[model samples]
Target: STLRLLISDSYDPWFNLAVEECIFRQMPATQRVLFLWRNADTVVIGRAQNPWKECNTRRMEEDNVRLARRSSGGGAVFHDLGNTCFTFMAGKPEYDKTISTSIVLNALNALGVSAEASGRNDLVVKTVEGDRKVSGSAYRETKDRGFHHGTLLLNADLSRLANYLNPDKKKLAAKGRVTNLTELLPGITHEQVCEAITEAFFAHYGERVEAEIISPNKTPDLPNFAETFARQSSWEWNFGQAPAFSHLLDERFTWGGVELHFDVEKGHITRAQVFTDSLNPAPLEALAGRLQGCLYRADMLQQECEALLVDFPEQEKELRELSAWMAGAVR
Candidate 1:
């Protein structure tokens, strides 16, 4: 089978990811595929990660950054136009991640950058300070097919990357010092990187394949493209599919100090506990019942709190204040 090369023209993460998955599931088993794409400002998380734990979603919403959940298992990553992403898909019995990682490293070497694969899924280079990561990858597999996809930090906004990803000290997540390719190789354009990777791929496979361009507006005739795109772009898949997690939010108000504990499962609050040091603990106690079965969203929780005001008119001021505070806390 000849090596297949695909390049995406769309910066939409959902569209690009959908195309990737569609190709993975629908492509011929014996054919090898290489896909290159990029996305605008977005936070792409692992398949099982909790968005509330991995990202400061409130900050992302305020800054107009999108949140995406990929079908691969790994850590969360931030993507921008300055980042270049690639995927390698092939059938099992011949599928090995080392081959793909070698091609990427060869491509970087061809671009006059010395890089090496670090640990399991990272590509790093030596800097004046020390080794810094430039690429991170994740994987997904079926009974006979597997795909490895990853990101290369070209000139992404590092500050926004840090600002949007939450610093959750509780979860044991891997940390790496990351740097951009532009810092190592000046004037490195995405086109140049793509070309180098293509050349390296062809050199490794001994086949010169023409790169096929795909986009949201100019999609290829894939059977599962529309269905995958719809699911990938939906809020249910992106946010509601998050793994179960426990969140504790607390705030000190003029009335008193309030602490809320939520046991979330599949994006719904399965259990809620409201603890307060206020004189009127009855309203907060009642508020916990209202939170049960509520969608784990800021607006939904806020509306539930507002509904309590109708029943407890005497504590309207406190309820409203708590409602406003909870709205900000959930996201």
Candidate 2:
């Protein structure tokens, strides 16, 4: 077959992403695929992006929003049920990003939204204020195959998007203004957009292929799906794959002022420095040794500090205070 269309019924990001990769890897070289999916509350970061620098993990954990790291390298994105995701996969020579971009643009145009491709990986719609982004995407390629995947803001929660995303100031800043499809075309539904895209896809390929539904309950037989899903849902892939970055934390307490600096690589604290203006400096100096090799997480760091308290019983109160402050700051 030259063309295939798949729509995911499950809203789980891990499952949907696993299916996307499975299809990309297993599909025939002569075939092409258009996969559409959506996810629940999730903050998906790029493969090489640092999660600590890209999102507010504490707020996301408190709100039950999951963090996912995709295989493609790009900026972070927020996904909700209101957002519809698309993936276009094809072998090399036939795998052109612009083809899928144009098809998606044509679909939106047919739906009465005057959208155009902006920059390398964005879809923008002209408005009275200016051009506002409605979709953003990323691409990945291997020796024989490649895929372009992205998200369309249909009726997503823009406030939560701003709330969860905390980009590093030094990275420089669209974040251009983003608008949902419903704002421009009231009463638009995900089903309608999917149908329009399917229509446009067929028009481009001149092949009439019925869309197939994939879900958690009913899955297609892909050999690598189980392993891919396992990796996608695991903490090792989502958090451990984050790029190396440094975090600085400080707090002033009744005891004194304490400062912490951590150099993290592969989600582990490779180097740690602790500075303090307290009466006792020995315990704080040892704190740096305890932090090295610890996972870069609030709970893990707190446990390391608590373990150090046993050796410095006389400074229990101060160590405990520092532990609590460190826990609060890490997340």
Candidate 3:
């Protein structure tokens, strides 16, 4: 297919949003999308991903970093200073996992990285020293468009990656696979690695047209859209969209103790209700229905926190503290 190569120069949520929107806008039954991702200290998860499971909220909050959810399905990935984030957005028909896998292999060979295609869509680099996974990919197919994105770890901050991904040994077990990418191609610079990958794709794809780089705006106007998608994360997409599960967590705090109730769907919170007597500003008489299905995902809690206030003005400290806890949970 004929293509326009978009080279993103930095990490900006707006641009990420644009790429996703572009794929949806220009997608055709037989066309595909290929774009370069650029970012520093960013962690991105698939659209349906559970922020609680995919990230270490406490660490991210403390470090003052940002997280984004893309239009795809896959595990969470950490992108940073020394990594090249490559994305291939395609229409459903043109979504080929193999073609993406092959190009990365070609890119590595050009860089003298000596890599092999492993599993479904990953690149394993072999060196005189040893063998390790240096690339990871993910694919997202919306109703009309699909994308396969991956990270090329080139001397990336392994510690930071570990901090962001915080790979869950237990969760990986649930998924029927275990991953430990701590030693991902640890000795290459970002520029050298990206040049190789770009060259490989341009040549491998055959006479592709490159798009003039478009930068993000001076003022962000998509705040509302971004908020709806990230904040509250939305119960409809996260928990309500999947199979159902109910959970009750026991709690004990200095003020008092209560059981927090949750209806989970697709790893997100559909209905989050806290059973506490202390923070009762309004009557708990009518809450079950309102919170009936709110996605309590990490990205969704920052805004509309007041809605999560089970009962406000009762125990002001406790209520604010509780909101903070809920925000922290989704964060």
Candidate 4:
């Protein structure tokens, strides 16, 4: 199949669906074309996640942070002028790294940098500071067709990462270090980076035909599929669709030796029990009742927290902490 070069510095939520559908329309189990796109100040999430949990909805609402969720299973990522994202959508039989990253490695070598695909997803480079990772990829294999994509840290705003990507403070704190890309790559240019990436991508497919998506916003070719992309981002898909299961996590940091256990289903709370030395807060049962309908689509812990805090008439800090842990919120 042919390779389509999609160069976009634009941040449109629909484009995420556009790219996914563009590849899915092709038949499966055959060598097919590729489509690549990049964006700025955009926070993209996985298909089966709540955008509020994966993205800093606060920043997105207040600041100009764009949100785009894809049809894949991976954590959310931050993108800007300094980041280069690439995607290859093809049939199962056609997906070949030897044909793909080989050209990319060659292109990086031409630019006086050593880059190689270490495994199914990681792209590492030997830098002065040990084994440095410049890019990472993820694959979404559906039925007979699939797409393997990743991001390269050309040089992005790292502070914004803490702001837009990982909004939960405790989880971010728990992840240990919140490091930026600049401290790692030292001196990297956006031009060379994007050019090298595009060249590398094109080298594998064929001649790079820079085509302006006449209907980037419109998908007449796949009308129903496009509609699905738009509707799939609803709260139902984000949280309600989560498989019905109860998660148990060990509760730590109870000054009263409280044994806390949380029970949830369909992103909503069914029960919350606390066994402790301190007087069981009279408000605990009431607070548990309030979490019944809220979407657990966010960083479970934080969303539960923010929602609980807002719904509760009396602002209680301790209850907030319990809310987060109940949702299994991660950094």
Q: TM-score per candidate, in order? A: 0.69, 0.68, 0.57, 0.59
Worst 10 residues of 3 by lDDT: 276-285
207-319 per-residue lDDT for model 1 (tens digits) = 88678888888657566787789899999888874333378786656655566777889999998776554546677878888999999888998888888887888989999
Work out candidate 1's RMSD over C-alphas. 12.8
How well is each residue in 1-331 modelled by candidate 2, as lDDT tens digits? 5888888888888898888878777666567889888999998876544466557889999999998877654456678988988988888987778888999999999999999889998999988899999998877777888788888989999888778867434223202199999998889988989988888888998898777888867556566666788888889888774333377776656655565778989999998776554556667778888888999888898888888876999999988898888777877
Please name the candidate that would achieve the greatest TM-score relative to the true structure.
1
When 1 and 3 are scored with TM-score, the better candidate is 1
TM-score between candidate 2 and the true structure: 0.68
Tens-place lDDT digits, model 4, residues 1-331: 2655545444444554465555565333354444445665767665434453345577777988766655443346677767666666666665745555665577667777676667677777865666677777766667676666667676667677667654444343343212234554467665566677677776666666664342345543333655565564444543343223354343433422223345667666566543322223434444444445545455544554565554555636556666655555422
CA lDDT of each candidate?
Answer: 0.81, 0.80, 0.56, 0.55
State the local distance difference test value for candidate 3: 0.56
Poorly placed runs, candidate 2 (over 4 Å): 49-55, 165-176, 240-331
Residue-wise C-alpha lDDT for candidate 3, range 1-331, written one tens digit per residue = 4665666665665455555455544445344456666676767665544465456878887997667655443345666656677777555555666776777778777766567877766777665655567777655556766667777766566667567655644334443222233344445665565567667777866766654354554322222434432432333443333223377543344553334567778765676554332223132223333445556664444334456455555555654665566555544
Estimate the TM-score for candidate 4. 0.59
Q: What is candidate 1's TM-score against the reference?
A: 0.69
Candidate number that wins on lDDT, 1 or 3: 1
- What lDDT does candidate 2 reach at residue 240? 70
